[PDB]
Symmetry: C2
Subunit: 942 residues, 2 copies
């Protein structure tokens, strides 16, 4: 009414700063130029010919009008202010921690560290690869095990991965997995949810009293336990081995500075969270989980691993190793970088002092509580006490704590848990004692307790082995030293603050500063995921709005924000479809149709969901073969569970048959799952639910601006129709838990909230249309040099195109890898290489890159084409030329004798923009086969 009058007044005013104009690369003049090149009169005409009219969304998205960056920040601040930052001593796998300011500013808030993606092009990712190598080394050192990966999603899913590995290397027919009842309860739920579709029996009970009478293939033990108790697990481990089972310890890595580590205990696998290595609570995440095991299991290791290899010059160089190896894809790289830098900055001595101090404060707390006549049940503990208070006092104690802004853990009636952490001071101790005392004057003085403190553990739990002894953990302890180390690593990596990284299937669009800013507000970053609901009302509002907006964008009736990667979204989606068929009394439906062009996460997820994968052929033009789909649907009619489809296709094509395809699947009793990684071609133009999908996931780290983080973090929320809503993961019928935290990595959800709020309905749709314009523009510019492999109706692509480089191989013996490395010399990260089609490149510019930048990339590809033609025409040595020898380091050009049939200038400055700004490749071409032959995954190798 008045808001309406004001809104109308505001529209009369001179135009304010529109975030849309900062998010888009091409402005209106640049857009018109691109349309002229394509032969289209208007953007509307292009879009009307690209998107099949039938699936087209017939109206504007119903979303709030766009806000300025300033206004959206103000609105979110108001929301955030409703959260309450307590001192949470809840524990359960999340403990407050001090992020060193230098790491917060120069990594977490530095787009040089958070904008690149998975290190597919290793020669221009040595910086984050080194940080990941440090992460692996820290994990190996602390756990006492032989190999570790470059992170998993969270503790619970890492434990589930340990269950999967154990099942896979089992010698027996055992079908049961033992889970100690004192694992964190969310871990137990994640495990059960993963075991269910596989028919694995999960036995949950006291590890002291497990009979080994039912055969098990593995066991999971918590160290220290969820209630804080430290046990000697050696005899359990011995018996498990006698019964042909592997043992996984979920072990707190900070505690391992003091306690005998899994490796020395005889454990086969160790998992856990590195959250308390300086990563914000984040109301659940993101935090890098670790996974360590024996070298003999390396081929079964989930996720990615950094290995030390050598380059063309014989110099040490890092790369992702053993890539032939779970459905995990995007992981938690940025947070693994942060955790390893926490280890670098603190060193072995600093880390140990952090744990010692925590343990001393906990022992002191215990002594004081004993004097207050409370019962203390943990014989030994690291940071966590189990306190017997009685049913009558427990609620009153919890309430008194809350009165002082403190949360404790309700365990069982009459018992309360307290977990201390790096933030705890002696003043916090006093608060706790006064809360338990029920009065401020205590029967002891704090200092007098110290003489009674024994902080030692028994010999059989006392660690003697050293850790973090490599120079990297000792050399960078001044702030200035770490600043410089971070800077030198960062300078090796080509990220979005340098040039466009046109990775097909990845959507490397703008990660706007205003979107990133709220992630580190304490009101979002400092909340424990299991804090009482009364303290998290701001997050509640954030979730409700995001659920509504993503529901409107996808057309789905219900949204789950829990899954913390695309892979997890797919898995959650298939789990809900499975639960749906069971709810109908249709237990025999386990066939999952998957087109041959699908992302590899798809069939991996289906198999984890107990489904049998049946491939569906692609036709002559690369599209889903409808006849073949129909034939297979008919054949598996009684058993059809699902079709997993990506729209537009992984070929970058808008198939007009998508509706017909969904009808066929439904006709034969299946559900339709849509992989939503290509949603950047859809938003505002079409909605998955409207054309027949029953469920989809979204990659917020592709389409909705969560940064690529060097390979994580992501979020993979799912949308479902009403008939599936009852089965969504918990926040009688739920599938259980998919992620360890109820809302996964909640803190980063503010990024996508900010994007939607600043773009508004017209803005979001314009972004999609420009993403499509730019993809078609590059295809048009390059089509005479590299065949465009797949095109849709009207000869248009969607948001990405595939360039066929196979002719270059035939004509000049030039490999796709050669072109990828040569682009480095032009100052560019290669697009997606050899997926979904071997020997090709899939290029996705997104809407955020300017025409000048698109033209530079096209000009680079055209120059490389002309270099390849020189080889073809025999105008230069086919084995010794810039393509074969790329990337060219400065040292390779400047040092030693130059024996090539081309100039150093041709090598380093092959385009004029490189003489304005030169990005230097840090190492020469990395020998891939050598690194896999000789797996070296720790700093000892460098």
């Amino acid at each position: 009414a008045i808001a309406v009058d004001l809104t109308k007044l505001e529209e009369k005013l001179a135009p304010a700063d529109s975030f849309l104009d900062r998010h888009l690369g091409p402005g209106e003049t640049e857009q018109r130029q691109m349309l002229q090149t394509l032969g289209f009169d208007t953007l509307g005409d292009l879009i009307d010919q690209a998107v099949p009219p039938a699936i087209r969304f017939p109206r504007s998205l119903q979303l709030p009008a766009s806000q300025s960056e300033y206004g959206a920040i103000a609105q979110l601040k108001s929301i955030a202010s409703k959260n309450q930052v307590f001192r949470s001593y809840i524990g359960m796998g999340y403990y407050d921690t001090i992020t060193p300011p230098v790491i917060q500013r120069n990594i977490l808030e530095n787009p040089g560290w958070y904008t690149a993606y998975t290190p597919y092009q290793a020669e221009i990712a040595q910086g984050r690869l080194e940080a990941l190598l440090n992460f692996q080394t820290m994990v190996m050192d602390l756990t006492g095990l032989e190999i570790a990966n470059a992170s998993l999603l969270d503790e619970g899913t890492a434990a589930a991965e340990a269950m999967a590995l154990s099942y896979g290397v089992s010698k027996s027919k055992a079908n049961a997995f033992f889970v100690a009842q004192d694992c964190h309860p969310q871990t137990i739920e994640v495990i059960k949810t993963r075991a269910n579709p596989l028919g694995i029996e999960v036995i949950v009970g006291d590890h002291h009293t497990f009979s080994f009478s039912t055969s098990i293939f593995g066991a999971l033990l918590q160290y220290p336990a969820t209630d804080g108790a430290v046990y000697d697990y050696r005899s359990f481990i011995d018996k498990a081995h006698q019964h042909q089972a592997l043992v996984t310890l979920a072990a707190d890595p900070l505690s391992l500075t003091l306690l005998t580590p899994p490796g020395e205990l005889g454990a086969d696998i160790a998992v856990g969270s590195t959250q308390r290595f300086g990563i914000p609570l984040g109301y659940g995440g993101p935090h890098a989980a670790y996974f360590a095991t024996k070298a003999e299991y390396q081929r079964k290791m989930p996720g990615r691993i950094v290995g030390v290899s050598k380059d063309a010059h014989g110099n040490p160089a890092l790369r992702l190793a053993l890539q032939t190896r779970s459905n995990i894809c995007t992981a938690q790289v940025l947070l693994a970088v942060m955790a390893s830098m926490y280890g670098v900055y603190h060193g072995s001595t600093g880390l140990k002092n952090i744990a010692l101090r925590i343990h001393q404060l906990t022992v002191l707390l215990a002594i004081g509580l004993k004097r207050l006549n409370y019962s203390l049940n943990n014989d030994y503990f690291f940071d966590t006490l189990r306190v017997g208070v009685g049913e009558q006092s427990a609620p009153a104690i919890l309430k008194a704590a809350e009165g002082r802004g403190i949360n404790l853990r309700p365990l069982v009636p009459g018992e309360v848990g307290i977990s201390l952490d790096e933030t705890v001071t002696v003043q916090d101790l006093l608060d706790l004692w006064q809360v338990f005392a029920g009065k401020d004057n205590l029967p002891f003085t704090p200092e007098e307790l110290w003489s009674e403190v024994k902080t030692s553990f028994p010999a059989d739990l006392t660690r003697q082995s050293l850790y973090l002894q490599d120079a990297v953990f000792n050399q960078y302890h001044s702030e200035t030293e770490l600043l410089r180390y971070l800077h030198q690593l960062e300078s090796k990596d080509l990220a979005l603050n340098t040039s466009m990284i046109p990775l097909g299937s990845c959507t490397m669009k703008l990660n706007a500063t205003a979107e990133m800013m709220p992630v580190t507000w304490p009101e979002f970053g400092k909340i424990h995921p299991f804090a009482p609901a009364g303290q998290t009302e701001g997050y509640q509002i954030l979730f409700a709005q995001l659920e509504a907006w993503l529901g409107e964008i996808t057309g789905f009736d219900a949204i789950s924000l829990q899954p913390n990667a695309g892979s997890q979204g797919e898995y959650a989606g298939l789990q809900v479809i499975r639960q749906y068929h069971l709810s109908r009394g249709e237990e025999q439906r386990n066939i999952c149709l998957i087109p041959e062009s699908a992302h590899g996460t798809n069939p991996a997820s289906a198999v984890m969901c107990g489904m049998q994968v049946v491939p569906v052929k692609c036709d002559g033009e690369g599209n889903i073969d409808v006849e073949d789909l129909t034939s297979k649907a008919e054949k598996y009619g009684d058993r059809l569970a699902a079709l997993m489809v990506t729209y537009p296709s992984t070929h970058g094509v808008f198939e007009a048959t998508i509706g017909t395809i969904c009808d066929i699947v439904h006709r034969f009793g299946g559900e339709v799952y849509m992989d939503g990684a290509n949603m950047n071609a859809q938003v505002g133009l079409c909605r998955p639910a409207d054309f027949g999908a029953d469920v989809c996931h979204l990659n917020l780290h592709k389409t909705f601006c969560i940064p690529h983080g060097g390979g994580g973090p992501g979020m993979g929320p799912i949308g479902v129709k009403s008939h599936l809503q009852a089965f969504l993961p918990r926040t009688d019928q739920s599938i259980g838990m998919i992620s360890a935290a109820p809302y996964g990595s909640a803190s980063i959800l503010v990024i996508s909230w900010m994007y939607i709020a600043m773009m508004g309905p017209q803005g979001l749709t314009k972004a999609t249309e420009v993403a499509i314009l730019s993809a078609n523009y590059m295809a048009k510019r390059l089509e005479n040099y590299y065949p465009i492999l797949f095109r849709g109706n009207n000869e248009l692509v969607a948001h990405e195109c595939i360039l066929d480089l196979r002719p270059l191989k035939k004509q000049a013996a030039i490999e796709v890898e050669d072109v990828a490395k040569r682009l480095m010399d032009f100052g560019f990260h290669a697009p997606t290489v050899s997926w979904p089609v071997l020997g090709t490149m899939m290029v996705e510019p997104t809407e955020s890159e300017s025409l000048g930048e698109l033209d530079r990339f096209c000009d680079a590809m055209i120059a490389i084409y002309q270099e390849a033609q020189a080889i073809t025409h025999g105008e230069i040595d086919p084995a010794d030329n810039p393509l074969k020898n790329a990337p060219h380091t400065a040292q390779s050009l400047i040092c030693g004798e130059w024996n090539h049939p081309y100039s150093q200038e041709e090598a380093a400055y092959p385009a004029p923009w490189t003489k304005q700004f030169k990005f230097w490749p840090a190492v020469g071409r990395i020998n891939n086969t050598y690194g896999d032959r000789h797996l070296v995954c720790s700093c000892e190798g460098m």
Copy 2:
């Protein structure tokens, strides 16, 4: 408490926590012991006893709060900050809220790559900030319509005082009066009067309309728009002033100049103002870059620094500081960079739209206030209304406003001022109307007023000329584009995130992340400097603590935090001394003794203070000649105002005679002023007040961690003895105002508070001691290669040493400049060149740099020594060698023919560390003489 001290004893029993001192210091205990052994001492304490004269050694610990961790100090400051209230201030008076584009906040203001280097003395490794400054000059020239502009001044009022001084210098008449319009901002008037006082300049303050020109003036200052908002046509006043041989300065709001006819077109001779509202936080006063623009004829008369376009050795364009009576040194570079990036990001169209919108909202506001029967006094305005409400209503309106978190400006009884700004929304106007209406239901609807708005100005005030038409202001409007432009410029510059910058007299120590963080908390950054005291209690506590702490460190009885540079500190100190002599009835005391080794700011400040400078000899050993001092003090006995002394000397030496020197000055009736730029050799070891200084300034941006900013911002607080306290600048006896804001750049004072709070008394003293250790270590390493020019008693230096490079000139025809450029090829910024002694380098490592870093720098100097020896010995051409051809760009090594008697590898990788990480000089050696000959100070030239 009691209990508090008991918690302290307990905490001390715990395992050692992360201590900020160990992050601040470069060398740890092991490294310190190694350095001490090379010096022939066992302990640092024993070395310090020999370095500092026993007579002046502070005999106890500093009385300061015990050190806090980074986490604890942040928490303490946060609780202080929370006592400030962030209102919507429409106070105006030269400060207007503005939106700092998040991308600029994150990637410049919060990026140590932009804030850690200092003045661009070595242009070849500072092209990035030099370009940003060129953009700033261009922006100022375009908007003001004047021919030249500098690279920033300290604030608006001092810029106007600089304009007064320029006008005085060029006047040929006997005119002694300067006219200041009474509608200038009142703080501007007081700064002007304070500067005019010691020079005997008559300041006439009155209505410009009625100034008679009867009294001869040399200059006039007019405010545009006026402080009460009114926009006047100043052409006729300017014409009359010129007929009376006076220069006219307009203090002109640069945002308003997107709409209003600019000073140049009006006939103005000089334009000054603040660029604060180009996206710089209010900062409770600063820091903000002021501008100064004038006609080309007055170019050798311009205060401050200016960037000019020149060319390098290869003929390519390159920037440098050009044209090397004002005392200004450190300016506001970082904030000039921010303001220029605001111009780059918004462009001419964007800036104009921001101004148009503000003006439209202001016209809307006035129309509504009129409908409410209020009197609107400004015929024309930009953003500021003068509202007649009557004496009775004014207090109730101001209070109602405060009730909604709004500050208005009390002008005169019965009149209220309102200045709108970039943050203002239609919702804010509604609040304003309701506050003035005294109720929420208005007799009009917001939108219905729009038909009445006439936002045009008369033709004589309407700007037609264009601005910001250069490509740089058009090409970077997407966030991705600006991110990449910022990153490219940043990459050209060598800052503290790369390597040590051992600039003598500059103290390039750690600017710790924890110190920098609170600068951008809204509770510090978003407060108007003239907000009511009730809203700034957090700042009140901050100032009181900093004053107490700096008082304890210096031994002085009172501290003024107002002066916003070392130069301003010196000037404020001499003003207080002058006022002191006046208060005793001793008007004839105007002689200022100044040793010949003093920083050039010293005599400039003395002259601005109406004093006659008398030099004092420095002896053969480099020290103040006590016999000469005594003779000059005797000779000028009855006229002696002051001695300005630096301790330790500008030669880096603790003179044992300092106390005797002070006694002599006092004996002859003078005061002692100490230049405190070398306080990094003093903290905890001696105190100026204790050995006889009456007043000193501190450079917070040297000794106390405020970052160097690429050449600003700084703060120069002064400490005085009790007998001078009455005369301190205002926040019957005060000297008036030295800075435009009562606490200068208040927001950056949190940096020094954080440093002191985290270091504690032992930490601060250890820092001083390690700074002395490291300087001595370098001197010892280098002494057989480069003569150490001045040493104290016991053969030790203080915190810096002077390397004599003059023999190289005699032997090899090598200049200091050659060595400075060659260091670039080793990855180092040169130390201080040719000051205080021509042909030498003064090296100050500070305590924050590691032994490894100190050793790399010494090793580089030793390799250069050997390169010079090769020339001396005829082993390499004396004209064609790496010293003469430095710095070497990558392109000069890679492109074209290589015709040198040394290899490209010897040029680019002269030391092993350069093969681990190489910093590339962006340009070759810049031609200095050519640049000054052909002064080009705008983007037009490059």
